[PDB]
Amino acid sequence: KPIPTWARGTPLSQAIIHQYYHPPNLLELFGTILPLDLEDIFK
Amino acid sequence: RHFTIDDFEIGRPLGKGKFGNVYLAREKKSHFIVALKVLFKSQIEKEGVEHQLRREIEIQAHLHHPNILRLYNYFYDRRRIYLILEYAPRGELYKELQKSCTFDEQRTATIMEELADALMYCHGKKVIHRDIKPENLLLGLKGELKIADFGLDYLPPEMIEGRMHNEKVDLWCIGVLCYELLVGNPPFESASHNETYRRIVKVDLKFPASVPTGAQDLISKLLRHNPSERLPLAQVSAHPWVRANSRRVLPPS
Numbered sequence: 001k002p003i004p005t006w007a008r009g010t011p012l013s014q015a016i017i018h019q020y021y022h023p024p025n026l027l028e029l030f031g032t033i034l035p036l037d038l039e040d041i042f043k
Numbered sequence: 044r045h046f047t048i049d050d051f052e053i054g055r056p057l058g059k060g061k062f063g064n065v066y067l068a069r070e071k072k073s074h075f076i077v078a079l080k081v082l083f084k085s086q087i088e089k090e091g092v093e094h095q096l097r098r099e100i101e102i103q104a105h106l107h108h109p110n111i112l113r114l115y116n117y118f119y120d121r122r123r124i125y126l127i128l129e130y131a132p133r134g135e136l137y138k139e140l141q142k143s144c145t146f147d148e149q150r151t152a153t154i155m156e157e158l159a160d161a162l163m164y165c166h167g168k169k170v171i172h173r174d175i176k177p178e179n180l181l182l183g184l185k186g187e188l189k190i191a192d193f194g195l196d197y198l199p200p201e202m203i204e205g206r207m208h209n210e211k212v213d214l215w216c217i218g219v220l221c222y223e224l225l226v227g228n229p230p231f232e233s234a235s236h237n238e239t240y241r242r243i244v245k246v247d248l249k250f251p252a253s254v255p256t257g258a259q260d261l262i263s264k265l266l267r268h269n270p271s272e273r274l275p276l277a278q279v280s281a282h283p284w285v286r287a288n289s290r291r292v293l294p295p296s
């Protein structure tokens with residue numbers, strides 16, 4: 001599989017450092033982890 | 044709130060199959076880099092671990108610590124369960140131990156301080172055990188430890204939800220890790236299982252010249268047959284050796 005520029009080599013590395021120094025609000029970006037609904041999943 | 048596979052971009056696979064179906068991804072809207080792990084319901088149904096997972100997710104749900112790999116959220120389709128997880132840029136510890144062969148005092152002591160705080164945190168949040176085998180340990184950007192943990196009528200719920208490990212099992216595993224980091228192999232390794240078991244139960248611990256006195260003391264205090272005699276977490280992070288050699292970095296967490 002060809003590997004996107006962003007995911008390879010250097011541009012990955014920069015994306016990581018920025019992200020490391022800019023910890024965003026995780027409640028916003030992802031939300032509230034809901035209880036796993038075992039039945040509405042395996043049936 | 045809601046999520047689908049359609050709002051991530053895959054970068055590359057990570058496991059090489061070793062850790063299942065795991066992928067470097069970023070969320071399309073934010074360009075935030077996560078690690079995405081795909082779980083097949085057929086593999087779960089099979090092994091009958093649906094209640095572990097349910098419960099595991101509830102555990103991770105409220106586990107915010109810079110030395111615990113973070114679960115951001117999850118989602119599912121007709122056949123798969125996807126976990127949106129924190130991406131640890133330096134990957135697996137056990138590979139970095141190979142590149143290194145062994146770890147110096149500072150690296151190893153730092154890792155003992157990070158473990159001790161991660162696990163103490165966990166107790167304070169009613170999570171009494173976590174799996175620490177070197178397979179489960181990842182490295183942050185600045186080298187920081189990241190513990191990554193997934194895997195009849197008379198059975199109580201704790202057995203069904205997988206939550207059966209004792210608090211003092213980890214203290215032992217801490218000893219084993221410390222030794223393996225400094226020596227480059229575990230303390231009771233052998234040609235055979237029979238021999239290894241005999242060595243483990245007899246705690247036949249032998250320190251080579253490459254283990255500094257201070258480590259011998261810590262390790263000897265953790266690796267005790269009797270679990271009540273094992274050195275508490277609070278005393279592991281307060282150990283003189285650990286405290287003198289630990290140069291621990293923290294992220295803006």
Ligand SMILES: Cc1cc(Nc2cc(N3CCN(C)CC3)nc(Sc3ccc(NC(=O)C4CC4)cc3)n2)[nH]n1
Nearest residue numbers: 057058062065078128129130131132133134135191193
């Ligand atoms: C889940 C996860 C994985 C990562 N990061 C990485 C990073 C990585 N790298 C490959 C080697 N170079 C040096 C770049 C870093 N290699 C792996 S290989 C790997 C894959 C999976 C796991 N562990 C799991 O998937 C556990 C959570 C279920 C450990 C190592 N995982 N962050 N988060």
